[PDB]
mmCIF file of all heavy atoms in Angstrom:
data_model
loop_
_atom_site.group_PDB
_atom_site.id
_atom_site.type_symbol
_atom_site.label_atom_id
_atom_site.label_comp_id
_atom_site.label_asym_id
_atom_site.label_seq_id
_atom_site.Cartn_x
_atom_site.Cartn_y
_atom_site.Cartn_z
ATOM 1 N N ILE A 1 -8.033 -46.323 -13.643
ATOM 2 C CA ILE A 1 -9.328 -46.163 -14.400
ATOM 3 C C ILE A 1 -10.142 -44.896 -13.991
ATOM 4 O O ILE A 1 -10.268 -43.941 -14.759
ATOM 5 C CB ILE A 1 -10.070 -47.531 -14.472
ATOM 6 C CG1 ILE A 1 -9.561 -48.488 -15.597
ATOM 7 C CG2 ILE A 1 -11.619 -47.484 -14.447
ATOM 8 C CD1 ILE A 1 -9.561 -49.938 -15.078
ATOM 9 N N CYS A 2 -10.595 -44.819 -12.736
ATOM 10 C CA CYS A 2 -11.661 -43.875 -12.301
ATOM 11 C C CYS A 2 -11.327 -42.399 -11.893
ATOM 12 O O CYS A 2 -10.806 -42.153 -10.801
ATOM 13 C CB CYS A 2 -12.467 -44.587 -11.218
ATOM 14 S SG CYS A 2 -13.917 -45.461 -11.864
ATOM 15 N N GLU A 3 -11.521 -41.420 -12.781
ATOM 16 C CA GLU A 3 -11.780 -40.009 -12.372
ATOM 17 C C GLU A 3 -13.257 -39.521 -12.205
ATOM 18 O O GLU A 3 -14.178 -40.120 -12.774
ATOM 19 C CB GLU A 3 -10.923 -39.117 -13.316
ATOM 20 C CG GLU A 3 -9.530 -38.688 -12.777
ATOM 21 C CD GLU A 3 -8.468 -38.536 -13.862
ATOM 22 O OE1 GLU A 3 -8.563 -39.024 -14.981
ATOM 23 O OE2 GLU A 3 -7.402 -37.803 -13.447
ATOM 24 N N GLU A 4 -13.527 -38.439 -11.466
ATOM 25 C CA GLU A 4 -14.851 -38.262 -10.799
ATOM 26 C C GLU A 4 -16.015 -37.543 -11.534
ATOM 27 O O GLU A 4 -17.160 -37.763 -11.080
ATOM 28 C CB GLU A 4 -14.549 -37.707 -9.378
ATOM 29 C CG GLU A 4 -13.623 -36.459 -9.310
ATOM 30 C CD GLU A 4 -14.207 -35.300 -8.509
ATOM 31 O OE1 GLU A 4 -14.139 -35.210 -7.290
ATOM 32 O OE2 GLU A 4 -14.805 -34.370 -9.302
ATOM 33 N N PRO A 5 -15.936 -36.899 -12.700
ATOM 34 C CA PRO A 5 -17.099 -36.871 -13.614
ATOM 35 C C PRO A 5 -17.292 -38.150 -14.522
ATOM 36 O O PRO A 5 -18.023 -38.134 -15.510
ATOM 37 C CB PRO A 5 -16.805 -35.595 -14.382
ATOM 38 C CG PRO A 5 -15.278 -35.592 -14.522
ATOM 39 C CD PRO A 5 -14.752 -36.202 -13.219
ATOM 40 N N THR A 6 -16.504 -39.190 -14.235
ATOM 41 C CA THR A 6 -16.594 -40.563 -14.802
ATOM 42 C C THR A 6 -17.348 -41.451 -13.751
ATOM 43 O O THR A 6 -18.268 -42.179 -14.111
ATOM 44 C CB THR A 6 -15.234 -41.135 -15.308
ATOM 45 O OG1 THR A 6 -14.421 -40.104 -15.858
ATOM 46 C CG2 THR A 6 -15.376 -42.176 -16.432
ATOM 47 N N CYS A 7 -16.867 -41.490 -12.519
ATOM 48 C CA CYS A 7 -17.653 -41.928 -11.248
ATOM 49 C C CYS A 7 -19.117 -41.410 -10.806
ATOM 50 O O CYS A 7 -19.826 -42.190 -10.323
ATOM 51 C CB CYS A 7 -16.748 -41.884 -10.052
ATOM 52 S SG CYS A 7 -14.981 -42.210 -10.187
ATOM 53 N N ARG A 8 -19.258 -40.154 -11.103
ATOM 54 C CA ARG A 8 -20.598 -39.525 -11.204
ATOM 55 C C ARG A 8 -21.518 -40.201 -12.300
ATOM 56 O O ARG A 8 -22.627 -40.657 -12.032
ATOM 57 C CB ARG A 8 -20.494 -37.995 -11.216
ATOM 58 C CG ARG A 8 -21.298 -37.205 -12.281
ATOM 59 C CD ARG A 8 -21.708 -35.782 -11.871
ATOM 60 N NE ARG A 8 -22.622 -35.180 -12.876
ATOM 61 C CZ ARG A 8 -23.552 -34.266 -12.616
ATOM 62 N NH1 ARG A 8 -23.765 -33.743 -11.445
ATOM 63 N NH2 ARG A 8 -24.281 -33.867 -13.594
ATOM 64 N N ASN A 9 -20.922 -40.377 -13.486
ATOM 65 C CA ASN A 9 -21.225 -41.422 -14.493
ATOM 66 C C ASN A 9 -21.352 -42.925 -13.999
ATOM 67 O O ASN A 9 -22.176 -43.626 -14.578
ATOM 68 C CB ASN A 9 -20.319 -41.110 -15.739
ATOM 69 C CG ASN A 9 -20.838 -39.961 -16.627
ATOM 70 O OD1 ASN A 9 -21.568 -39.082 -16.192
ATOM 71 N ND2 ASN A 9 -20.476 -39.935 -17.881
ATOM 72 N N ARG A 10 -20.523 -43.463 -13.113
ATOM 73 C CA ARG A 10 -20.518 -44.781 -12.353
ATOM 74 C C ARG A 10 -21.361 -44.978 -10.923
ATOM 75 O O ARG A 10 -21.601 -46.098 -10.645
ATOM 76 C CB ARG A 10 -19.149 -45.436 -12.360
ATOM 77 C CG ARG A 10 -18.316 -45.403 -13.662
ATOM 78 C CD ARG A 10 -16.798 -45.541 -13.474
ATOM 79 N NE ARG A 10 -16.168 -46.162 -14.668
ATOM 80 C CZ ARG A 10 -16.345 -47.419 -15.062
ATOM 81 N NH1 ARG A 10 -17.018 -48.311 -14.395
ATOM 82 N NH2 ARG A 10 -15.805 -47.777 -16.170
ATOM 83 N N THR A 11 -21.472 -43.862 -10.482
ATOM 84 C CA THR A 11 -22.536 -43.513 -9.482
ATOM 85 C C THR A 11 -23.962 -43.745 -10.069
ATOM 86 O O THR A 11 -24.851 -44.314 -9.473
ATOM 87 C CB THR A 11 -22.243 -42.091 -9.010
ATOM 88 O OG1 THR A 11 -21.194 -41.985 -8.058
ATOM 89 C CG2 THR A 11 -23.497 -41.463 -8.349
ATOM 90 N N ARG A 12 -23.994 -43.275 -11.307
ATOM 91 C CA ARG A 12 -24.925 -43.528 -12.476
ATOM 92 C C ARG A 12 -25.125 -44.995 -12.977
ATOM 93 O O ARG A 12 -26.231 -45.522 -13.002
ATOM 94 C CB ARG A 12 -24.469 -42.411 -13.525
ATOM 95 C CG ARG A 12 -24.682 -42.560 -15.024
ATOM 96 C CD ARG A 12 -24.612 -44.024 -15.556
ATOM 97 N NE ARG A 12 -25.127 -44.121 -16.939
ATOM 98 C CZ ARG A 12 -25.838 -45.130 -17.434
ATOM 99 N NH1 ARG A 12 -26.269 -46.140 -16.738
ATOM 100 N NH2 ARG A 12 -26.127 -45.095 -18.684
#
Side-chain angles (χ1 to χ4, degrees):
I1 278 142
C2 267
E3 265 148 342
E4 52 127 83
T6 325
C7 329
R8 133 152 188 151
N9 282 25
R10 319 156 152 292
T11 282
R12 155 328 167 217

